[PDB]
Design a protein around this nucleic acid. Sequence first.
RNA 1: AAAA
Lengths: 437, 437
Amino acid sequence: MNEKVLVLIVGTNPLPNYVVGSHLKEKYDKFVLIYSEKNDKINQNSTYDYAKKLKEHLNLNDKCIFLPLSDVSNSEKIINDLREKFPSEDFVEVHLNYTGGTKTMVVHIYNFLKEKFKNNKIKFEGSYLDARDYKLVYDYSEEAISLKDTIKIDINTLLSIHLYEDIHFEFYDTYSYKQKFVDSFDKISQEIEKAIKDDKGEDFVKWLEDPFRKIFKGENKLLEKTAKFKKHIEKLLKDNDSSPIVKFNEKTPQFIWDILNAFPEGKKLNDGQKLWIPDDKITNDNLSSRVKDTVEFLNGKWFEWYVYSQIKSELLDRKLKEGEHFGISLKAQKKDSPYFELDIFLINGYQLIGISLTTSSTRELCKLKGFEVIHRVRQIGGDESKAILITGMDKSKTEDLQKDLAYETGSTQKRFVVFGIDDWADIGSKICEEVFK
Amino acid sequence: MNEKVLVLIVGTNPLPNYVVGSHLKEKYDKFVLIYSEKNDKINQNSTYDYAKKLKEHLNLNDKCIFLPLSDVSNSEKIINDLREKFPSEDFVEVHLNYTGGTKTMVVHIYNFLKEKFKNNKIKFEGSYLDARDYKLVYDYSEEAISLKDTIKIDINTLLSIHLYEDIHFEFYDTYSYKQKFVDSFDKISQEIEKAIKDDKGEDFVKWLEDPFRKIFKGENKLLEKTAKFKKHIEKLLKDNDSSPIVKFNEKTPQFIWDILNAFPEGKKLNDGQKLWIPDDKITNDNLSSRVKDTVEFLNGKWFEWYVYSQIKSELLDRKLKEGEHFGISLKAQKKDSPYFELDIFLINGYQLIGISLTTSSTRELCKLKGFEVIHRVRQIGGDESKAILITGMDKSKTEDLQKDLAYETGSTQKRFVVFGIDDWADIGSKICEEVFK
RNA sequence: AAAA
Ligand SMILES: [Mn+2]
Ligand SMILES: [Mn+2]
């Protein structure tokens, strides 16, 4: 005998159970996962899919007992099913983690176990995981254990316990544009990093709006069909005074030219110090081989590799593993449901920090992109996950956004942090400070 | 003499305590609002402002006692602060609503009061408001009191208990564009309503994309400067055929011309069957008085008035009161925080149904508008608010968006509803269905 | 994990 059992209340947030289970798996022998059933008459769904995922990812196997509850808000039907379905075996210690579930479930499961085992002088203990100071507090023993730097979770386990699948991500050694600009990516990335670190981001993004996007963006497949481009180029020449081609050749700053001249000669958007305008001998395949990949990277993809490279320094010194706790280009889906894409993911302990990146200074576009990162990390990491939005907006607008999209969760620490264009140079440090503090 | 007390555990969601308080305020002469203090060192904010608002709108005044809990995660510190600060007065019935607060609070308060009032001179009772079935279940009593159709909240009170101020909404008799298009708004709306009922939505939207949003919405202030515009007109005219100007003058369906000519004479975008092309000596203020308000209302505001008029009738049949339970163009702010804008608001009992309207068929733009309406109704009405996003997408895209952004709250009823283009003509009954099921 |  001498069996020790752990009773977990399984709600719609599975992460708090996973953390407590990992910390107490060894010191207990059997596990009771109290979940819920589906009853559309009472508008109640089931937390069983989370209970299956908690059994699998904690690897409790057959040492796990599933206790179903028919009504999560009916005191009578809770205690009824409890006596009829709680294990009849003897135990030396009965530990309850009432962190999840309803309040009804919590109240009636706590008092029932208190009067079924603690009534038999069998060790009884309650526990609740603080989502604010990251501690597991014991009711009777009065112990407060911080599981912040002890319990660790990865991106695959975190999304699977939240019922997401097909988890794809990229690494420092598997970035897509490392292949598109092979034997030249480091040079292009180094040059851009210099300018952004030199507080030239506002100037770069301005140049990206005019003329970069005035010339290289328009009709779909503008840069994959020469005819569309050549017609587009001639139309811009007709604008004369307001022509972006004139501004590209003449008013383009030098740090831009250095970035452009960093691209491989076969994939340069410039003809020395002027805009490369293809002739009638240049085919549609030649254009995409030179313009498409370079334009896509300068349209916002550089800002993603920048932030990921800026933060990679502090992370490797914090002994965090790549592909497990940090990565880029995160994609996943629910079964028979559309996919999602998060620019940068980062997991400090078990707190998921989702980072969405945009080079925009427009209020509406940044606000919606913040809206998105809040909801994704909610569906992906839980209701206690952080969302940081890095934008090209100024400090004032950035601050307003944080205030506008702020939701009271009971924690002084903010879960929605917006970073402005000024923070770009030291974004790596600014994030490290935010995430680890 | 016989002081019956009701104890409410105050959390971040204040709506449940207001609902229960409004129902049981008459049968109790004392009220204890257990609220949290602010200790930044333990990452814990104060729900005092939420409990303050409840005392005001429930008009408890002197019958209200405030009990500050220093730590809302430590069992020991909870009970210690309780014994130290709970009213030591004589009570004949002690009723606890444990629907809110942290799990630890709901269990340790429950059992602290249950023992402090075990003497049969004092009768103990416990309540919980089930958000799923909208009922007030009583502990140990099979009694089931539904409050779905009994308790009703006004839009000003709901935003006030969630800490928002400067609540401004427009109703039927005070629509802004009804004052801007004088003696024509009824004819403009009639033509738009008539066309939508004739399955001409997609038609309008496609014309709104091209050539409408290519002639009047190409530059950030082209309808505020006559030069930019005539420049924009000539820049489109450079294309000759396939220019947005030609499609307007030629390939423009008749029901569009009917709406365009329904506008007041001095505020029409057309000059016969052609696009009035502003000539020289047209002031940037004379241009504004003609195209500015017409372009804005024709860019989508029309969809907001359409949906509002279709729902207005259904609701009046019911008891919903305009301005008190439904309305259009709601704006409000938290103190020293930016304002928000929800297109249409509705309150079915005490449930906030927020409706965001967009005439777009693009999945990205609609997706983003979905994250917005979800986050807004949770800040404005609480975590049990429904969001509805009436898009211009087809049934396939709507069901995909509905699955992409859906979060698991624990209810078998949807809380994010994505109506599509085909639902437009019967949006009145469609909304009546989803809101009052 | 402060109306699951
Ligand atoms: Mn992005
Ligand atoms: Mn809208």
